[PDB]
C-alpha cells in the first residue's frame, strides 16, 4: 500500500519515539528543532520523559525478562521482536498506559543496544515501535487527539 511517511501522524510519532529512544541510550538531549510536531512534539517529549522513566522502573522485572526470552544481541533479533510486539499489543483494549509501556520497553531495548555497541540499530528499533503503534492503532490515536491527547491524559499539576 502507501508509504508510512505519507501519513503526518506516522511521521510525527516516528520523530517523538526516535528522539525519546536516542536520548535514553545516549544520556544527552537533542537541541536541534523538531521537523514535524513542533510545540506539540516538544510537549509530548516532556510528558514521555516524566511518565516513561516511571514505567521503566515499575515494569523493570517484566522488561528484563522479556529481553531474555528474545535474547537481543544483533540486527536480526530486532526483526523477530516486531512480530512479538504486534501480536501482544493488538490483543484486547488499547489505552495510553499500554502505549507508554511499549515506548518504555523500546527505551529499555535501546539502552541495552548502547552497552552491546549496536547504536546503529536504535533508529530501526524506533521505526519498529512506531510501525507497531501507528499501523495497528491509527483510528484510536486520531479519536484520542494523538500526541495532544497523550499530554492531556497524563497531565497532573504541581505541587
Amino acid at each position: 500500500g502507501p508509504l508510512g511517511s505519507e501519513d503526518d501522524l506516522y511521521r510525527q510519532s516516528l520523530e517523538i519515539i526516535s528522539r525519546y529512544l536516542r536520548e535514553q541510550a545516549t544520556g544527552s538531549k537533542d537541541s536541534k528543532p523538531l521537523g514535524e510536531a513542533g510545540a506539540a512534539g516538544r510537549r509530548a517529549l516532556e510528558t514521555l520523559r516524566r511518565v516513561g522513566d516511571g514505567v521503566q522502573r515499575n515494569h523493570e522485572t517484566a522488561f528484563q525478562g522479556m529481553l531474555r526470552k528474545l535474547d537481543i544481541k544483533n540486527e536480526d533479533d530486532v526483526k523477530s521482536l516486531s512480530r512479538v510486539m504486534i501480536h501482544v499489543f493488538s490483543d484486547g483494549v488499547t489505552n495510553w498506559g499500554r502505549i507508554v509501556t511499549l515506548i518504555s520497553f523500546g527505551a529499555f531495548v535501546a539502552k541495552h543496544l548502547k552497552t552491546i555497541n549496536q547504536e546503529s540499530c536504535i533508529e530501526p528499533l524506533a521505526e519498529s515501535i512506531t510501525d507497531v503503534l501507528v499501523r495497528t492503532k491509527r483510528d484510536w490515536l486520531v479519536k484520542q487527539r494523538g500526541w495532544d491527547g497523550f499530554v492531556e491524559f497524563f497531565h497532573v499539576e504541581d505541587l
Partner: antibody
Amino acid sequence: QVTLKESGGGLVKPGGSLRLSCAASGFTFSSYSMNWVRQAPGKGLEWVSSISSSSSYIYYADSVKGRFTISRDNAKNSLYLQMNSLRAEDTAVYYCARQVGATWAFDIWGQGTLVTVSA
Amino acid sequence: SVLTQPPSASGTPGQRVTISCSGSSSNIGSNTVNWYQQLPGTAPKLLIYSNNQRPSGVPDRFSGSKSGTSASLAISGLQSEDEADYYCAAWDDSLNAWVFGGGTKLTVL
C-alpha cells in the same frame, strides 16, 4: 483558585462579527483541551467547539461550521471564539469549559458571556 | 438534540427519581456519558463522569448508569436543593462532535 472568565459579549447585528475571549487562571492552561458551549434563552446546552492543548485538533458543531473559528494563546492563558455571519439563532450565553484529560468531562466552566444578535 | 431526555421528571422529598438519556451506537454505544446539573441563572456543574463517577462535592445520592445506547441518572432520596435542570452528554464518533441531551427539569413536588 481554578477559574475561567469569559468576555466580549454584547449586541451585534445579523451578518456581523464578534470575538469572544476566555481568561484562564490557577492552572496549566497548555495541558488541557478547551470547549465553547452555548445556551439560548430558556433552551438547552449546545456544544459549539473544542481545541486540543497544542491546537492540533479542532472540532465544530454543524450549526457553526464555516462561520466560527476557535483558537488559543497558551503564552497568554487565553481561549478565543471568532464568530462571523451571525444570525438570531446564535443569541445565547457562551460558556468556556475545561476538559479533563483522562475522562473528557467538563469540570471547570466560566460564568458565561451573553451574545445578542439584534438589528 | 441527538440525545433524547424527558423534559420533566418529579417526586416528593425522599422519593427515588430516574432520568433517562437515549442515544445511539455512535455516541452512548461507543463512549462514556457525563451528567451536568444546572441551577437557574447559573453555569452548568459536572455531576457524573465516566457513566457513574461522582466528582468531589457531589452527594452520594446521585448515581449514574449506562447500558447499550442508553444512560440513566438516579436521585435516591429527593431533597429540595435537587430542583434543577439535568443534561447528559456523550462524544459522537460519526459527528466528531459532543452531543448534549435536551435536558430534564427535575421538580421536587
